[PDB]
Design an enzyme around this catalytic site. Structure first.
Site, PDB file in Angstrom:
ATOM      1  N   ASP A  27      33.956  29.615  42.649  1.00  0.00           N
ATOM      2  CA  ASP A  27      34.503  28.407  42.010  1.00  0.00           C
ATOM      3  C   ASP A  27      35.725  27.895  42.799  1.00  0.00           C
ATOM      4  O   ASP A  27      36.608  27.218  42.277  1.00  0.00           O
ATOM      5  CB  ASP A  27      34.871  28.615  40.537  1.00  0.00           C
ATOM      6  CG  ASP A  27      35.859  29.746  40.338  1.00  0.00           C
ATOM      7  OD1 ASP A  27      36.102  30.170  39.178  1.00  0.00           O
ATOM      8  OD2 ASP A  27      36.367  30.230  41.387  1.00  0.00           O
ATOM      9  N   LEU A  28      35.754  28.242  44.083  1.00  0.00           N
ATOM     10  CA  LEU A  28      36.854  27.823  44.982  1.00  0.00           C
ATOM     11  C   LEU A  28      38.174  28.248  44.348  1.00  0.00           C
ATOM     12  O   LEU A  28      38.135  29.373  43.816  1.00  0.00           O
ATOM     13  CB  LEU A  28      36.720  26.353  45.293  1.00  0.00           C
ATOM     14  CG  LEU A  28      35.348  25.956  45.882  1.00  0.00           C
ATOM     15  CD1 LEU A  28      35.375  24.511  46.326  1.00  0.00           C
ATOM     16  CD2 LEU A  28      34.996  26.882  47.040  1.00  0.00           C
ATOM     17  N   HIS A  66      37.769  35.194  48.857  1.00  0.00           N
ATOM     18  CA  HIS A  66      38.315  36.010  47.768  1.00  0.00           C
ATOM     19  C   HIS A  66      37.326  36.146  46.609  1.00  0.00           C
ATOM     20  O   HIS A  66      37.143  37.244  46.084  1.00  0.00           O
ATOM     21  CB  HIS A  66      39.658  35.420  47.350  1.00  0.00           C
ATOM     22  CG  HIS A  66      40.409  36.223  46.345  1.00  0.00           C
ATOM     23  ND1 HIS A  66      40.463  35.837  45.016  1.00  0.00           N
ATOM     24  CD2 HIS A  66      41.155  37.352  46.447  1.00  0.00           C
ATOM     25  CE1 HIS A  66      41.200  36.704  44.345  1.00  0.00           C
ATOM     26  NE2 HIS A  66      41.633  37.627  45.190  1.00  0.00           N
ATOM     27  N   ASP A  67      36.638  35.099  46.170  1.00  0.00           N
ATOM     28  CA  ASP A  67      35.596  35.264  45.134  1.00  0.00           C
ATOM     29  C   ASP A  67      34.512  36.203  45.617  1.00  0.00           C
ATOM     30  O   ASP A  67      34.007  37.046  44.877  1.00  0.00           O
ATOM     31  CB  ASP A  67      34.998  33.899  44.757  1.00  0.00           C
ATOM     32  CG  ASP A  67      35.932  33.033  43.944  1.00  0.00           C
ATOM     33  OD1 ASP A  67      35.902  31.797  44.068  1.00  0.00           O
ATOM     34  OD2 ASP A  67      36.700  33.535  43.122  1.00  0.00           O
ATOM     35  N   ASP A 126      42.896  41.051  47.728  1.00  0.00           N
ATOM     36  CA  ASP A 126      44.025  40.151  47.510  1.00  0.00           C
ATOM     37  C   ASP A 126      44.807  39.936  48.801  1.00  0.00           C
ATOM     38  O   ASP A 126      45.204  38.820  49.145  1.00  0.00           O
ATOM     39  CB  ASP A 126      44.898  40.740  46.412  1.00  0.00           C
ATOM     40  CG  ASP A 126      44.302  40.641  45.013  1.00  0.00           C
ATOM     41  OD1 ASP A 126      44.882  41.289  44.113  1.00  0.00           O
ATOM     42  OD2 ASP A 126      43.302  39.933  44.810  1.00  0.00           O
TER      43      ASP A 126
HETATM   44 CA   LIG Z   1      37.974  31.411  42.731  1.00  0.00          CA
END
Ligand SMILES: [Ca+2]
Length: 122
Positions: A43-44, A64-65, A85
């Site tokens: 979801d960016l 990262h997602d 992270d």
């Molecule tokens: Ca995201």
């Protein structure tokens, strides 16, 4: 899944540019990796802190997602979260490298705010 799925997954989620670059190549040829059934959804930077200046962090949010969703599915999210992270922060700082002067500082500041947010509420 293939027995080397954990090593492939680790190879796409290191903090280095060569790991980011390996992931980018895989993301653009998702079909070649179907045997691994990775989750490629993202979801960016939805639900991230404000980015008044518009620094283009979408590609960092996407990788990262990828680390979060795929380590969660593997059942080893807790053990790998801090690396994912940090790689996120390193990806964002590589974006900031393209700005200089005051703009670099503003970019780094926004990146630190993004990093802190996932470190504390991720
Ligand atoms: Ca995201």
């Amino acid at each position: 899944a293939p027995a080397d799925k954990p090593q492939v997954l680790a190879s796409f989620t290191q903090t280095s540019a060569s790991s980011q670059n390996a992931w980018l190549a895989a993301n653009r040829n998702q079909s070649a990796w179907a045997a691994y059934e990775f989750d490629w959804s993202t979801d960016l930077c939805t639900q991230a802190p404000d980015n008044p200046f518009g620094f283009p962090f979408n590609t960092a949010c996407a990788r990262h997602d990828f680390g979060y969703r795929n380590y969660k599915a593997a059942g080893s999210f807790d053990a790998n979260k801090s690396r994912i992270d940090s790689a996120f922060y390193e990806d964002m700082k590589r974006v900031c490298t393209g700005y200089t002067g005051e703009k670099n500082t503003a970019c780094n500041s926004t990146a630190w705010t993004y990093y802190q947010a996932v470190k504390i509420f991720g």
